[PDB]
Write a protein that binds this ligand. Structure first.
Ligand SMILES: Nc1nc2c(c(=O)[nH]1)N[C@H]1C(S)=C(S)[C@@H](COP(=O)(O)O)O[C@H]1N2
Ligand SMILES: [Cl-]
Length: 444
């Protein structure tokens, strides 16, 4: 027909409320996207009562990734913020660091002055209120995000550190940011020989050389962790990744679970996964389960009667698919102080090349050989405020800004209430494969 956009991103969220997996191609099934062994919201974290655990309860779920390399599933939860939380700790009252300097939060230096008045003046300036030397964890995490971003910006402006940083893989980049956070750019830039070895990928030699430094002697247990990260390119010294086979043994228990009030089964993924998730979240005992295709699916028509009786989902909130356009996202962002990415809204298909909110009027789409049918708008909640990089829920933006201008028409206030609309729910009319780059055609 007529092209109305192009597929820009495809996202599968294998575990409900956890990190998305970007893909260049995906099968469109009646239940949602599939890439190999990963299917959209086919895994679920449950509590001891069998009830879902979502990012409304545990926003740090968004830090967990489940990925698949053909033969093996990997669970991982680490990134620079988590690495530095482990190494820097958390203190909500002004304290003195090991050099005697007034500090607060996650290693946030307030001043080198011996004056407590100066430390408290810096604190109140940085937080924007009269804290009397005490902050909340949310405030400590805000300062932390600022400090990490500043460390990275600084590395990228440093002619000695940028070439090494650019040369490093993602995990080893975190180890370099870690050192800069601890000791500052100039200190790290002084590690001339180790930095050369790192840029040359001489990992064992770099590790041997880094352990001879004053840094190692002053903080040997932290340095040992950072050095292991440089040596191996893994998270072995922090929350170590868990490697699992794709096939869960049928001797594992099947649990009766509850997702948004309705029952659905899942196969327990085993004690290793339960322990790993629970330890990372520091939570009550949780399990991971997986939906198997002989189990009874949940029925979107029971949730919202605009969906067809035949529609089926596993653990998704309501719909097999969520579609969003770049234009819609850019329009929201022009109204926000803190910019957001598509990840906050957890769409499966992001389309470029259209005007704002064009998807709201795309009733029937053809993408590749796949036909999709629009059902209703996606109404948003606090999950959009959960930050994908830090796992910290703002509980405010961007949901407030969306509340300001994206409420549903008065003619439509039975379905959505006052939850703002952002993105569109679609169902499958014809199975097939879609690819990033595919033109999107409006039918009819
Ligand atoms: N396929 C699909 N994507 C979706 C939805 C859905 O129902 N189906 N709900 C959206 C909304 S309103 C929420 S808050 C989050 C929930 O993501 P989760 O089910 O992984 O926790 O998915 C978003 N993307
Ligand atoms: Cl130490």
């Amino acid at each position: 027909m007529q092209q109305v956009g192009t597929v820009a991103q495809l996202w599968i969220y294998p575990v409900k409320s956890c990190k998305g997996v970007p893909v260049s191609e995906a099968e469109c099934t009646a239940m949602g996207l599939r890439s190999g062994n990963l299917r959209d919201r086919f895994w679920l974290v449950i509590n001891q009562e069998g009830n879902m655990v979502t990012a409304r309860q545990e926003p740090r779920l968004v830090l967990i990734s489940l990925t698949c390399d053909g033969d093996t599933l990997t669970l991982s939860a680490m990134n620079i913020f988590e690495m530095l939380r482990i190494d820097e700790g958390l203190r909500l009252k002004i304290y003195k660091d090991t050099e005697g300097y007034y500090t607060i939060g996650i290693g946030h230096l307030l001043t080198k002055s011996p004056s407590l008045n100066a430390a408290k003046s810096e604190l109140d300036k940085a937080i924007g209120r009269n804290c009397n030397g005490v902050i909340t964890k949310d405030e400590a995490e805000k300062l932390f995000n600022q400090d990490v971003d500043a460390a990275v910006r600084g590395i990228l402006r440093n002619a000695k550190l940028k070439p090494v940083y650019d040369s490093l893989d993602a995990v080893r980049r975190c180890a370099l940011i870690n050192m800069v956070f601890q000791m500052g750019e100039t200190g790290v830039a002084g590690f001339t020989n180790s930095l050369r070895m790192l840029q040359q990928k001489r990992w064992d030699e770099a590790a041997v050389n880094l352990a001879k430094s004053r840094w190692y002697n002053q903080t040997p247990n932290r340095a040992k962790r950072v050095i292991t990260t440089f040596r191996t390119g893994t998270w072995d010294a922090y929350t170590k990744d868990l490697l699992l086979p794709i096939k869960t043994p049928t001797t594992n228990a099947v649990h009766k679970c509850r997702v948004h009030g309705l029952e659905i089964e899942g196969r327990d993924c085993g004690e290793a996964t339960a322990q790993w998730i629970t330890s990372f979240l520091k939570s009550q005992p949780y399990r991971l389960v997986h939906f198997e295709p002989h189990m009874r699916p949940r029925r979107p028509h029971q949730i919202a009667d605009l969906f067809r009786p035949k529609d089926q989902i596993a653990y998704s909130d309501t719909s097999p698919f969520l579609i969003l356009s770049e234009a819609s996202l850019a329009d929201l962002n022009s109204r926000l102080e803190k910019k957001v990415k598509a990840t906050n809204f957890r769409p499966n298909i992001v389309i470029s090349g259209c005007d704002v909110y064009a998807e709201d009027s795309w009733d029937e789409l053809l993408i590749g050989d796949v036909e999709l049918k629009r059902v209703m708008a996606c109404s948003r909640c606090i999950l959009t405020t959960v930050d994908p990089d830090t796992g910290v829920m703002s509980r405010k933006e961007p949901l407030e800004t969306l509340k300001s201008y994206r409420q549903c028409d008065p003619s439509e206030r039975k379905l959505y209430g006052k939850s703002p609309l952002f993105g569109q729910y679609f169902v499958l009319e014809n199975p097939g494969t879609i690819k990033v780059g595919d033109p999107v055609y409006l039918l009819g």
